[PDB]
Every structure is written in structure tokens, then in C-alpha cells.
Amino acid sequence: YQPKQDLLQNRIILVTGASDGIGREAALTYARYGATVILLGRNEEKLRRVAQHIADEQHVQPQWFTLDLLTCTAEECRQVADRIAAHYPRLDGVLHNAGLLGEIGPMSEQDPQIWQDVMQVNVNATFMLTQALLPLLLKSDAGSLVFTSSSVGRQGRANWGAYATSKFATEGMMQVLADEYQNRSLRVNCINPGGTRTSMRASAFPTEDPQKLKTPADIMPLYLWLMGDDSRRKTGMTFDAQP
């Protein structure tokens, strides 16, 4: 997939987990294809840095929001949606890249509190944030809501504990949303980045040589395709960046 440089021109896209890794890559890449990108993350100064990088390249500084998905309330999610609604007439896209890995190890050992934290970030807060942004998404001529999945969201595997559970939940919640919007202007889908050179991947696989992995840059074609009009007939699906 090699789209024109103005695929996303004027499309307003919110990118969560934007501080580093695949989230930062997608924010940069979406801005480079003409998007008006809105960044969301945990750390204010780390967001400022990504936004400044886009400003250095596009010459308009992206707006950012700090939101801690672990601790956020429904009302805090509504505050973000209210703040976006005050600056923009619509969202054309929402890419959820934020996620917590939690503990890798056997179910006999999984820490209950960490397990609850994984569910809270990956499922409940991602839901709460989504719900607050649905009205803005429906203002798009062709809105696109994307969740982050994993191969362990399709087939559970030993030691993947809360993470795998939360990615199965993410496929389910994506399928509910996609069915509810199916004949309307909003499409909803998941992306499995596959093994990619990130700190999360290295934490799970400390022996692996990350230099043998594709980078976040390498996997961008799929991320671009789901936000652009070439994917507009596709909803309810889960895609592998590296099949």
C-alpha cells in the first residue's frame, strides 16, 4: 500500500499512547499524510515533544491531552470530548494504541491487582474514552475507530494472562461497535501490530533480538489504510500488520 501524500488531508484523528512507540509513529505518519492529529497520553512533557516534532515538520502544533487511562473517570473522558468539540467540528478517526501489558507468567501466579489494572486500561477506560467520542466520530463523512489487538486476542496462549484476556475483550467490544454502526458512516476495526520493535515487546521477550524485528515505521501501511477512504467498506474486522 502506497497512497498519495494527501490521503488524510484535513482529517482530524485522535491518537492515544502517542508518547512513544507505535502511537508516536502513527501520530507522525498521519501528520505527514495531511492529518490534523490530536495526541493523547500520560506524560505532558513527552507529548509536548511529539507535538513539537510534528510542528517542526508541518508548521502547526498539534493539540494534546494528558489522560491516565488507569485512573480516569467517565467524566474525565467526557472533558476530553468537550475540549475536542470546542476546537474541532468532528473526529475523522480514533486510534487506540494505549495498553498495559501487566504480568507475563502462569495463571497460578498472576497478581490480582495487576490483572485488574490491565482490564481497567485495555478494556474499561478504552471503552469509556470511546463512548465519549462517538458523537464527534459520527460527524465525520467516513469516521474510522481502530483498536489495538494481539495474536493472543485471537488464540489464547500460556503466560499471557490479563493481556490475552483483555485483547479477547477488545475484539468483542470492537465487534459490538462495528455491528451497531454497520450501515452508518462509522467503521470500526482492530489492528494486531505483530512482533514490533517496542519496549512492550522487549519486556515480554527479553532474549529476543529486537533488531531482527520490523520497526513501527515498517508497519505503517496498514495504519494509514484504515484511516483513509480505501478501507471505507471494511468494518468489524481484525487485521494483521505482519501476516
Cα–Cα distances (Å) from 119 to 70, 99, 162, 167, in that order, read: 9, 10, 7, 9
As given in the structure block, the three cell numbers for residue 90 are: 468532528
Where in 36-166 does DSSP place strands (E)? 36-41, 63-66, 93-95, 143-148
Establish if 164 lies at the interface with a second copy (CB under 8 A): yes
Establish if 169 lies at the interface with a second copy (CB under 8 A): yes
The conformation of residue 125, written as its DSSP 8-state character, comes to I
Largest Cα–Cα separation, the chain: 52
Cβ atoms within 10 Å, residue 199: 11
- Give 7 or 191: the residue with its C-beta nearer to a second copy: 191
> Among the candidate windows 19-27, 52-60, 86-94, 105-113, which touches a second copy by CB under 8 A?
105-113
Establish if 142 lies at the interface with a second copy (CB under 8 A): no
Establish if 229 lies at the interface with Mg ion (CB under 5 A): yes
Residue nearest Mg ion by beta-carbon distance: 229
> Among the candidate windows 75-83, 146-154, 161-169, 221-229, which touches Mg ion by CB under 5 A?
221-229
Q: Which residues between 122 and 141 bind a second copy (CB under 8 A)? A: 123-124, 127-128, 130-131, 134-135
Q: How far apart are CA 170 and CA 55, in angstroms?
A: 33
Q: Cite the DSSP H helix spans in 59-160.
A: 74-87, 112-119, 126-138
Which residues are 10's β-sheet partners?
none
163 in catalytic set: yes
Q: Which residues between 200 and 239 bind a second copy (CB under 8 A)? A: none
The catalytic residue among 1, 30, 33, 163 is 163
The conformation of residue 215, written as its DSSP 8-state character, comes to P
Annotated binding residues for Mg(2+), as ranges? Answer: 229
Query: Applying CB under 8 A, which residues contact a second copy?
Result: 74, 106-108, 110, 112, 115-116, 119, 123-124, 127-128, 130-131, 134-135, 152-153, 155-161, 164-169, 171-180
**Active-site positions?**
163
Query: Applying CB under 5 A, which residues contact Mg ion?
Result: 206, 229
